[PDB]
Symmetry: D3
Subunit: 233 residues, 6 copies
């Protein structure tokens, strides 16, 4: 009866994130790491550990999978953006990744992390060149005014998914010049499954300003149908 004295957490705290913001190399349970080559044909063919979010960049966790990394790579190489914003930080491995990548492409880029809870960031202070954190609430649209200094072209990425359509209208009006991206990750397929009528009306409300970039918008499951930018249709 271990339950009778336990206080249990709401496991929803870990929705789509996992339990620990820091990376740990996967650990084999039902097999040796070194398999005998004389019994090579008998060796189990499955992954060996959970395939939920096993990705990393330099000892930091990555919530963007390799297919998403390939898309953002092409997008960065093409646009050569001076600014990449990120609503939703979590552990910050995405922030660091964008920074490292741009550095090697020779793009002078500023990466910006806005979140209401920056406590879980895992980047060391001694590895923060061209990265800026920003405490803020999504619901509050005035969180976003103070990033009207940054240069163009610009990529705005929504990994937070709250008050998102109001944030999209705020950006369109006050932020995005021609060519800039507004990308919503993960959620467009769910909103459209759960709310076809309202979703189509809201998305279509931006028919005069944004468009879906078809070169990138079907190239990874995380970005599926959610990559937009300020360009004429």
């Amino acid at each position: 009866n271990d339950y009778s004295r336990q206080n249990f957490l709401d496991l929803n705290l870990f929705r789509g994130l996992g339990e620990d913001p820091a990376y740990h190399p996967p650990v084999l349970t039902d097999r040796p790491r070194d398999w005998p080559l004389d019994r090579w044909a008998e060796a189990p063919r499955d992954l060996g550990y959970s395939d939920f979010s096993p990705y990393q960049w330099r000892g930091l966790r990555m919530l963007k999978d390799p297919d998403t990394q390939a898309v953002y790579h092409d997008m960065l190489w093409e646009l050569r953006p001076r600014t990449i914003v990120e609503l939703g930080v979590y552990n910050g491995g995405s922030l660091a990744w964008f920074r490292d990548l741009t550095k090697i492409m020779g793009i002078d880029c500023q990466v910006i992390g806005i979140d209401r809870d920056l406590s879980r960031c895992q980047i060391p202070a001694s590895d923060m060149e061209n990265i800026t954190l920003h405490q803020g609430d999504c619901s509050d649209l005035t969180t976003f005014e103070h990033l009207r200094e940054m240069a163009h072209p610009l990529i705005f990425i929504d990994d937070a998914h709250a008050n998102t359509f109001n944030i999209m209208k705020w950006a369109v009006d006050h932020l995005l010049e021609e060519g800039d991206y507004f990308i919503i990750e993960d959620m467009i397929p769910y909103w459209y499954r759960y709310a076809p009528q309202l979703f189509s009306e809201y998305l279509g409300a931006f028919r005069d300003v944004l468009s879906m970039d078809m070169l990138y918008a079907n190239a990874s499951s995380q970005l599926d149908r959610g990559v937009l930018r300020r360009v004429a249709a």
Copy 2:
């Protein structure tokens, strides 16, 4: 330009539920309802509308899909519950279904629906025989305390998913008896996927009090590995 003059409801509110608690029948957009038989083989084979949650019961939207209904039908026939508690209510279609089914079966059952927002419920007052609504909070257990003098057997069903494991602890200590069910719809495969270490330990904390019922636990994707009892 229609984006500026409009202001946007948050679509997260319609998550796993939909835009509207009232039932509306599907409507065809890209094909006539009445396909002519002389061109019978040209007719599209796909369903012709959203497969999201198109199910109903007597004009009330039903979130439990036909496979889950089959499972619960068998559970009711086998266990003949005196009480069905539904945590999380939405449109009330589950409540009216559970009541109608126990009525044709001859079982004397009270259905109970607990939820913080009951405004979405579509059951008319006139059809509430053996159904009781209850407005309360998950995060405090006082909600449930009051009226733990219901007859058994009992089936408790979590459709709210807040403070779930505490509510289950409370349930074993105060409500449940041998043969009663505690059922976690939908969530378990996700909680395991995302927090496996923590979930495993938590579920196994209940090893001396609850067990997974293997006759029902693999029979529906909504009840997948969440049918517990005793």
Copy 3:
């Protein structure tokens, strides 16, 4: 030894029906019913028993699986039929279900079941209110010529599958009214596979009197492309 001493029942008698018209709850063999929770993840994920026809309604077996039940629910709620005729009966599970469901909806509806052999039926006689059995050979236009005048709207369901296109020509001329359904369960995808030319033409012969109802024709594997109704 055992083989010489037996008479062997022909197994085609049980085609798509099972060995026993009475219901029995499925039984686990390779696992305990109450899996311990400290090994929750170790538990097997498959069903644990045959998926053939394990469906029931109040202790009666159901040959229409849950998805078909959903389609018939919507159709009953929309049309509010006065009569439902089932061609082929077996255990009566559907009959009971149809009557019970119309009762719950407040639809005054008589349910009629027709079969050559009504000995399999399992409905307790004290539970036949608004259910009528007719004994009679399906492949005989006589059986339907002898039926009384029923109330409309009506749903006519073919679960027998013998001499079916003649029965349908009779239905169109003598029974069906605007809005009424002639449903063929199970059989149409097979008839199309084995006889595409003859089937296409035969079905096409009813182009001015029946149409495929597209709201329900693709909503279930059992009713798939077999939901028809009068006019348009």
Copy 4:
């Protein structure tokens, strides 16, 4: 309004067989046969006709598909049957096939086909060497003690599917010597689905006289779990 002046054949007579015993080549309806190579990539990737049973041997229809043919080709090469009995005939395509293939392999084999209705047979009277058609009723078992005693080894194939287990009980007692095959095409997977208890128990009756030949029993979809032989 063509339905009122039509003669409706029973489509069930075509089950698993088709409309016409005679072969006719498949035909394209929605594309040219000669696709131009300057639009090669635009060309469709799908078969272009019904994939139910488009197989032939020398202008005769073959109900046995290529995978099943491959299994029989090997079984013949290994066993070198002196006799092949095919219970159930239709167009006689597999009869001709069996005779033709055994002839090419240098096997001295007699192909026998039994059926109630031999009218459909499409084999010319002239091309009938080493092939005997018997009249037969699967209900009466002195139809098979109407065997002139043929040579061994012997393959016995069931394509008729009536009174099958009794015809099997008979085969063991009067025909099958060490190594002879009794094959049931098509039915076994469906019988296990519908009557798992009886099927398991009936087959289990023959444990001391027949075994399932695992070299071939998993090798095609039509012979699936249906290939058996004498002893072990």
Copy 5:
């Protein structure tokens, strides 16, 4: 141990296997004779590798059953008096073509061409209407050396070296109207790897060849590679 052996390049056996001779499959992890009393406990998988299991009369067959069915229909329609196969390996398909044309009553001459014939397993006694020819591919003169052959003619590429030039020569010097030129296996791969070059090269033959859509989509090995001469 590894310190001793000289290692053969395994690329030698690509798409072919280690041994041109046929040997029947052998079960490793089950009895060949499965007891009927535990019939449902029997494993459902093939029980041996499925790389290239097929045979004709004790010779390996690299063309699988679906491919044989297409060639069977082609041969029966077209009635070729010459079948050329560029690339030979074990000779299985060579003997199959000859045997099929023989029971079809067609007067066909099957020709086999290869730089290495040492792997050909056809017995010299079973060689009638078959000619082996040992020449290199990229040298087009190999082919001039025998356009004495009768028509209709089916030319088959199983070697895949310098294929388009060989097709050019064939179009000009060999193929009368109706004749086939088939590329097995490779065209899907060439389109995947070099889509611009492949399309342009295939389109360069638009007034002389077409894709035969009756056979081009009917097997995975022939897939989009069955071409024939349209009148010019």
Copy 6:
């Protein structure tokens, strides 16, 4: 026209494509800017060929994202001083490996061995820490001649010729405990085509090499071919 053209052998492009230089994809059947008011009508597929559409800093990449992710992890764990690609093509892999070791801060040299370094597309300025070498995969003297590099080292085989002989050489004269010998793409094909000989050949290295199960199942290019030293 065809009789004019001399046709290149498409096998030259096998596994690589026609152009070592990167060009981004373009759409044919859709606009790049899809209008949001038609968002649900937009096509769902990629829009271009998904053969080898990957890149690094304007250079082609043959290793796909999942493979990249396995090499990322490996590099971070192993901190290799020397990485050796056996086969170069366009050099994309070389540049990535060098760039990646640089952002991780690892002091690494990258060597690229190939008979043909002509297709290499790395600009002269960006060659810091990237030594190239001409040589044949038939000399084991090609590999000695490469001066002694620091360890830990990884050895990737992307040429696949005389590989097992090259593996024996590396174990004895080059590889220390924990160094890697990785064979890309090829092992699953060599075990399908030659199961017996591959089983025996790999088996010989049991005392000096293991399979690294942390990485061996994590991508389809590396599938079952990542090795190092110390098992059982």
